[PDB]
Amino acid sequence: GRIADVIASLVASSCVKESLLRFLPRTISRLSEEETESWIKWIKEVLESPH
Amino acid sequence: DIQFGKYIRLSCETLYDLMTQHWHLKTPNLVISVTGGAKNFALKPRM
Amino acid sequence: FTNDRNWESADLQDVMFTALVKDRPKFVRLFLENGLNLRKFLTTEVLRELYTNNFSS
Numbered sequence: 001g002r003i004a005d006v007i008a009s010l011v012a013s014s015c016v017k018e019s020l021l022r023f024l025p026r027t028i029s030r031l032s033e034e035e036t037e038s039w040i041k042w043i044k045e046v047l048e049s050p051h
Numbered sequence: 052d053i054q055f056g057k058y059i060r061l062s063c064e065t066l067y068d069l070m071t072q073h074w075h076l077k078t079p080n081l082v083i084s085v086t087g088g089a090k091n092f093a094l095k096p097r098m
Numbered sequence: 099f100t101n102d103r104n105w106e107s108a109d110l111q112d113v114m115f116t117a118l119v120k121d122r123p124k125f126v127r128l129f130l131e132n133g134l135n136l137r138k139f140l141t142t143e144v145l146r147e148l149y150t151n152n153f154s155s
Contacts, residue, residue, distance in 0.1 A: 091107050091133050
C-alpha cells in the first residue's frame with residue numbers, strides 16, 4: 001500500500017520521515033512542511049498502541 | 052429503490068432501528084474497508 | 099505502475115496496441131491487471147487496423 005507499507009514497516013521523527021519518503025516519495029514534495037509534520041503527528045498517534 | 056436498492060438519503064443510530072426491522076436481520080459480525088478506492092488500483096492476483 | 103503517480107490509464111491504450119503487435123504477453127497481462135477495459139479498447143477501428151496490416155498474408 002502507499003501508506004499501509006509505512007505503518008507495517010514502523011511496527012523517531014527521522015525514521016518516520018525516511019520511511020514516509022521512501023514509500024511515498026512524490027506526494028510528499030507537493031505537501032507543505034507543516035502538513036507533513038501534522039501527518040507525522042497522526043502516524044505517531046496511530047503507532048502509540050500496536051496491539 | 053433504484054434501477055441499474057433503497058436510498059434513505061439522510062444528512063449528518065436512528066437509521067439502524069429502521070434497518071433492523073424493515074429490511075434485514077441483525078449482524079453477528081461486521082466488516083469495513085476503511086481505505087477508499089483510488090482512481091487507479093493495482094489489481095494483482097494476491098489482492 | 100506501483101507508484102500510482104500521474105496516469106489515468108486512458109492513454110495506456112496506445113502502448114497496449116504496440117504490445118499486441120510486438121508479442122509481449124507479460125506486458126499485456128500487466129496492463130490488464132493495473133486497470134484496462136479491453137471491451138472499450140477494442141473498437142471497429144482498432145480491429146480493422148489489427149486485421150488489415152498486422153495480419154500475416
